[PDB]
């Protein structure tokens, strides 16, 4: 079945879609991201960051603690199941990771990790 998606943050806020559904019968699962706009990471900067749910609050909190040298995520964060890089207007950047760390029934959620900013870019992942 289809194993990718591709995602766009751009200034406004908003990644187009907030909801990913990934089939079990992928093995691996790949986000591409992209950010249309112009303002440079520093000030706009996205990811894209995989956790369950209720760990969501937890890595956002020490990531925004954790600077723009740390992408905004704690070191060792054994919480975050996959993530890109932070990137800025302009950049891409893609990651694949084995859907044997997902679990049905369990719910997990993306986010982005730049301060502030997960409560605008976010959206629920399912292992369906
Ligand atoms: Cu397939
Ligand atoms: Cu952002």
């Given at each position: 079945a289809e194993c990718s998606v591709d995602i766009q943050g751009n200034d406004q806020m908003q990644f187009?879609?907030?909801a990913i559904t990934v089939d079990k019968s992928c093995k691996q699962f790949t986000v591409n991201l992209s950010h249309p706009g112009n303002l440079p990471k520093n000030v706009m900067g996205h990811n894209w960051v995989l956790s369950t749910a209720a760990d969501?609050?937890?890595?956002?909190?020490?990531?925004?603690?954790?600077?723009?040298?740390?992408?905004?995520?704690?070191?060792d964060d054994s919480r975050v199941i996959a993530?890109?890089?932070?990137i800025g207007s302009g950049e891409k950047d893609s990651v694949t990771f084995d859907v044997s760390k997902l679990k049905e029934g369990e719910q997990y959620m993306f986010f982005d990790t730049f301060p502030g900013h997960?409560?605008?870019?976010?959206?629920?992942?399912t292992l369906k």
């Open positions: 187009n879609t907030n969501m609050q937890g890595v956002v909190t020490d990531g925004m603690a954790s600077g723009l040298d740390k992408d905004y995520l704690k070191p993530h890109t890089k932070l997960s409560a605008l870019l976010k959206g629920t992942l």
